[PDB]
Design a protein around this ligand. Structure first.
Ligand SMILES: O=P(O)(O)OC[C@@H](O)CO
Ligand SMILES: O=P(O)(O)OC[C@@H](O)CO
Ligand SMILES: [Co+2]
Ligand SMILES: [Co+2]
Lengths: 344, 339
């Protein structure tokens, strides 16, 4: 009585034939995974940076952003391994635009087949210039359409406790970051990393678009992302110490989100978080192996009236602009270099 | 590289033909929905009770429990509308047995086809004696297999914030209770009820076992369940007053879980919670429309087997359950007098 209807959906395999990855896309996605693994598992003393828009709504603006980020990445590659945020799926507090896949026209038409086409085309476009990408793995079905192109997955604060998302992460072929809970505590993310490291058996959709029983291997490349919350921000040295004390043997390095709960309702705080994180890194904190930054061409955000949208400005959370981003990243690279001196 | 394999899965439509609902089963499911709706929406002054095991691992023990509960339901039907907890899916803190569907043999062999068969057979067995059932809607695919038999769905504390579960709830044909978060606060459950009331568009598995785009209508029959948590228990008058203050216009009545966070790691506290809830109801609290109780044939729990004892959270036993529900029925009668 509460299903209005079902509409046909192209299978993952069909979409993959229709929008093939280039060899460059595939190598880029592989390289991103390898570099991320090496950092979170302590093989490499560079910092892993997941940086880019809160959400993608415009392929052309995403491409411009990507070209700037790739240029900066080439310059800072001795110190930072950069993966672009290319987030397709947005968890809402209640309701709102859910992202490019769910409603690519941003006008409540919900053309999900077009959204999947736009998402896969975007992912090919970005990786094809040699820039690895990451996204929040919110939907448990959409990864089948896109995972060959992805180097990093986030499980959001609102889904870190969800057994379905822990199951999902246990079968993804790339590193996964679990955000702490929206209440600001990290136990649920530590628990999620534990759970996702195990094999799981569950029903899921295959590349052929049919439901089957999935058996996963477990994902040893899960790590905690500190993103603040109701209890307060958690990017500081005492919070980091508290996090380290909770991590089991075998744990990977920590990532600090400069945005969301750690920015206290304000994009202008992201450079302030960067300063505190840089201080810790430069003074020899080796457990901070990653950061996350919400960054766009231009700063701030805007409401949704698509033809009436301002260019290069977020339609979800407010972001720092490009110029601020470059400053933040250069400062972070300097801190990485200083950490090496302390470690020598 | 992290998918070891895929194994074939019977479709929902196939399972529904293989294990058909009886006419009694379908009428029972429909009745349970109607009665739950009337209570949570304030049409009926009875209290809705979701009562039964933490989890089902044993179909025979579940049937014996059900026959007892059905007899008690008949006794107390002027005051209580009873739906049995027939929970098939268990959200774990980290890892552990996930329930009857995931691993019916309880031996890490994960025969999900057998689990779905056992689950649907169980659900037909229970509803066929005239006892409506409810379950936690953890898996987003399994409801296709079972929803025709279900009168109530819970979204657990660990998934109330999940947009996938809000989407699911928005398309379920029965009332849905969203537990408060594990931190003990209600905001996320209020938000979830708002979200689930809207129409959603999302990818989902159909009765034919294939993925398609689903459009839902929205579910106006979602309500909050108070189940305690880190910030403390939330079954007392202050907690209920605070809850009522955050409920928007158009909200449904509250349900109080006696167990989980509200029992403070101890099944023996469920009757104590009952006393505090009864006091409120009896003195005129009309916003409490539901309770949830973890109950089995025998009390306690056991590690992973003794008949009628839970292999997950500890439950009150049958005799205690009779006492608790008779006292609750008395409180409902007393509230009628106040009103
Ligand atoms: O739904 P909102 O507006 O609270 O936004 C949630 C975002 O921060 C994450 O998608
Ligand atoms: O995983 P556990 O042992 O903490 O048990 C969780 C239960 O209370 C809910 O399934
Ligand atoms: Co954001
Ligand atoms: Co329980």
């Amino acid at each position: 009585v509460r299903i209005l209807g079902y509409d046909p959906l192209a299978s993952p395999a069909l979409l993959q034939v229709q929008i093939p990855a280039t060899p460059t896309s595939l190598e880029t996605a592989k390289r991103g995974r390898r570099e991320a693994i090496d950092i979170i598992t302590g093989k490499d003393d560079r910092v892993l940076v997941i940086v880019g828009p809160c959400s993608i709504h415009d392929l052309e603006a995403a491409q411009e952003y990507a070209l700037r980020l790739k240029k900066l990445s080439d310059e800072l590659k001795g110190d930072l391994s950069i993966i672009m945020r290319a987030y397709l799926e947005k968890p809402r507090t209640t309701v709102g635009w859910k992202g490019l896949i769910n409603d690519p026209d941003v006008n409540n038409t919900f053309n999900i087949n077009k959204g999947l086409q736009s998402a896969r085309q975007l992912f090919v476009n970005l990786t094809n210039i040699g820039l690895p990408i990451g996204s929040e793995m919110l939907d448990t079905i959409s990864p089948q359409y896109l995972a060959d192109l992805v180097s990093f997955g986030a499980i959001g604060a609102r889904t870190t406790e969800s057994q379905l998302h822990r199951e999902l992460a246990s079968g993804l072929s790339f590193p996964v970051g679990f955000k702490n809970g929206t209440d600001g505590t990290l136990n649920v993310a530590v628990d999620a990393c534990q759970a996702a490291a195990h094999s799981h058996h569950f029903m899921g959709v295959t590349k052929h678009g049919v439901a089957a029983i999935t058996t996963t291997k477990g994902n040893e490349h899960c790590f905690v992302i500190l993103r603040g919350g109701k209890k307060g921000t958690n990017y500081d040295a005492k919070s980091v110490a508290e996090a380290k004390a909770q991590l089991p043997a075998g744990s990977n390095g920590l990532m600090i989100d400069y945005s969301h709960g750690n920015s206290n309702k304000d994009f202008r705080n992201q450079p302030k978080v960067n300063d505190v994180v840089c201080e810790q890194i430069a003074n020899g904190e080796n457990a901070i192996t990653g950061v996350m930054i919400e960054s766009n061409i231009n700063e701030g955000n805007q409401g949704i009236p698509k033809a009436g949208l301002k260019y290069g400005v977020s339609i979800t959370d407010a972001c720092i602009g490009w110029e601020t981003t470059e400053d933040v990243l250069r400062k972070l690279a300097a801190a990485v270099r200083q950490r090496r001196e302390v470690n020598k």
